[PDB]
């Protein structure tokens, strides 16, 4: 069948989609993937057609997490971006032949396009599953009028501001297991909890970490403007008996940091899945992808949440006993060292990380995702005839 | 397409806009240009429609010794932002515009844009300013705490009103004087810009905007055309400088060539000391035509004057008086294109010695040519129109496509 995929502008959204697109292609699907130019190479590597839409970020990069955020302003930028992307894509696809639509769950545009084409549609949810459980500013005026335009014309059914990034499809594919999800039992059969979507991705000196203990540190791809934290890591981990792989993001130069201790390997970006296979501990911001990848590879965590859903993922890691949280406000050299030591020392963390990892692996990954979608498309094509 | 342009009340804001408007008109844009009456004739000579707003200026006949308060300036601009947007919306509300262009330092241009819900582009006639840059400029004009500022509560009340009633979207004091559009056209090169790497692609660095201006032949060019020419100007604001003009008359009376001295529109040449026989003294000159012909420029370090002199590869002596002149003076000294005199060290002897050091000097001449090439290389008025027109294309195509879907 002919599939229209619309992604979200972030590496945490694109990465899990790759395994699903790979699986669908192998099972006969012919895929057109819309995304921002930044992530083009990740899609062209599957030999899938890439098409561009305008990158409405600019924020989504070089964040401290200390920034002034107007929820309602952010919502306006999102809703304006939705209208623009839906208008752009529909104009290109309106006379093309697609059997169904896949889209990133946080890009309302994808649901709008599926409504415009009147096709079956499937959302890919890279956060926890979210329902209602989980706005009177200088930008509030536009918000309400954007939402009205989208509701009237683009069948967006935006009731609450929370609806704006919770665009459920016919199924919502969730890249966790019911074993990790907060309030898992509130989510019905249309939430397919497949756990992590893990496959080979698009240099790293692996010979330097072969037969070394590995401690991995990364604040992900957005909240990585963390010079003070990276300098604290250097003092905390210099006596680690092994190698410390530190990902510092694509903005801070290594030379802007204090002198790098001889046991560190510092890079802007690392093959994170390959590092985690070798890692005995992961110091993470609690991004859902980084957290779920770490637990998938049975790595205990120290979570330093910066923003968005990281606070709810940090809370969940601590609740199930697979790691320990340090709030950014409580970060010191001493507490960071004591916390790293505790999570490596206390075998409880590694055992719980293994248990969650088994649950995440048992959920079936990109294969279960692609199988559920195809089965749902077979069933609509069948119940149609009936 | 139909363009609404909203200018800032100062010659340094109007002048670079001239080249952009000419480029857009010559690609068949129809432009309406709001400004103060003072600049009418610069705008009407483009054969675009000039329209008035009230001159709320403070911004003329200054010495640079006047103490100014940041919070006070905020409140001046917020009050005038409210008056200008009210007046302009009343006049344009029945008209059909495709997009807005406005001076980066006029919040009213952004207010009018989101009030017509149109795409918008800001023209930045200073260096590009991010929060860090904006805080050092604001810092110069703050004595104590925000709380204890006479105008603080007044700033908060104006800002509430402008958000509630003028969809002004002010979040930090900087929103009032740094009103980024969909793009921000900056009239400098990344080469001359401090912290250039910190500005993303929505900042379009076009260098200077240089074209023939209205009143361009008013001057006796025949008298300077084949002579060594020394040009002196303290710009259009910080030109209340009788004592400095007197020092120039003395210091340059032996100059082997012509001295063109612009004294501004407030001090009568009759109030100065005797004018030497090699001087042409005028309240205002066609400054681009003078710099074409100048061997040296003694400037206050205004962004436009400095960037216009460097464009024509003129080495500089810079005597910064206020505002962004200290940071443009530091940039001139950093690129080796001129020498700075601090106003506190200004003497007849130090003025003579500095002019003598820069005149004919290979080092300043080579460094002035090198930065002038950085400035000319950024693409000017033409690159400014290309970038704006591209953005209007996509926003128009998007709007009209959405209409067709409806
Ligand atoms: O050096 C790096 C840093 C990050 N990532 C990947 O980037 C994604 C980050 O997503 P996450 O949800 O953890 O956080 P975000 O960057 O969205 O905050 C994950 O798939 C990581 O494996 C990686 O491959 N290499
Ligand atoms: O006799 C004069 C004096 C000034 N200007 C123009 O006025 C502007 C002054 O701007 P600047 O940013 O240099 O200084 P300000 O006057 O804003 O301090 C520049 O475009 C000059 O070319 C001019 O044409 N003739």
Author numbering:
A (entry chain A): 2 to 59, 62 to 137, 151 to 218, 222 to 405
B (entry chain B): 2 to 58, 62 to 410
Provide the authors' original text about this structure.
To address these problems, a novel glycosyltransferase YojK from Bacillus subtilis 168 with the ability to glycosylate Reb A to produce Reb D was identified. To solve the solubility problem of plant-derived glycosyltransferases, YojK, a Leloir O-glycosyltransferase from B. subtilis 168, was selected to determine whether it had the catalytic ability to glycosylate Reb A to form Reb D, as it exhibits prominent glycosylation activity to various substrates like other bacterial glycosyltransferases with a large acceptor binding pocket. Then, the purified YojK was used to determine the glycosylation of Reb A. To our delight, it was found that Reb D was well synthesized by YojK with UDPG as the glycosyl donor, which was confirmed by LC-MS and NMR. Based on the catalytic mechanism of UDP-glycosyltransferases in the catalytic process, catalytic residue H14 of YojK firstly takes a proton from the hydroxyl group of the glucosyl unit at the C19-carboxylate position of Reb A to generate nucleophile, which then adopts SN2-like mechanism to attack the C1 carbon of the glucose of the sugar donor UDPG to form the β-1,2-linkage.
To better understand the molecular mechanism of YojK to catalyze the formation of Reb D from Reb A, we solved the crystal structure of YojK in complex with uridine diphosphate (UDP) and refined it to 1.90 Å solution. It consists of two monomers in each asymmetric unit. Similar to other bacterial glycosyltransferases, it folds a typical GT-B characteristic conformation containing two different β/α/β Rossmann domains connected by a variable loop region (V210-P224): a flexible N-domain (M1-F209) and a relatively rigid C-domain (F225-M405), which can be verified by superimposing the crystal structure of YojK with another bacterial glycosyltransferase YjiC. The flexible N-domain will allow YojK to accommodate various acceptor substrates, while the rigid C-domain contains a typical plant secondary product glycosyltransferase (PSPG) motif (Y288-Q329) with high conservation of sequence and structure, which is responsible for recognizing and binding the sugar donor. Similar to other glycosyltransferases, the catalytic site (H14-D107 catalytic triad at YojK) locates at the cleft region and closes to the center of the sugar donor and the acceptor substrate, and most of UDPG binding sites (except Y288 and D328) are highly conserved. However, the substrate binding pocket is highly plastic and flexible, and a large substrate binding pocket is observed in the crystal structure of YojK, indicating that it has an ability to accommodate diverse substrates, like the large substrate Reb A. With the crystal structure of YojK, we next performed structure-based engineering to improve its catalytic activity for the glycosylation of Reb A to produce Reb D. Probably due to low binding affinity between Reb A and YojK according to its enzymatic parameters, the crystal structure of YojK in complex with Reb A and UDPG was not obtained.
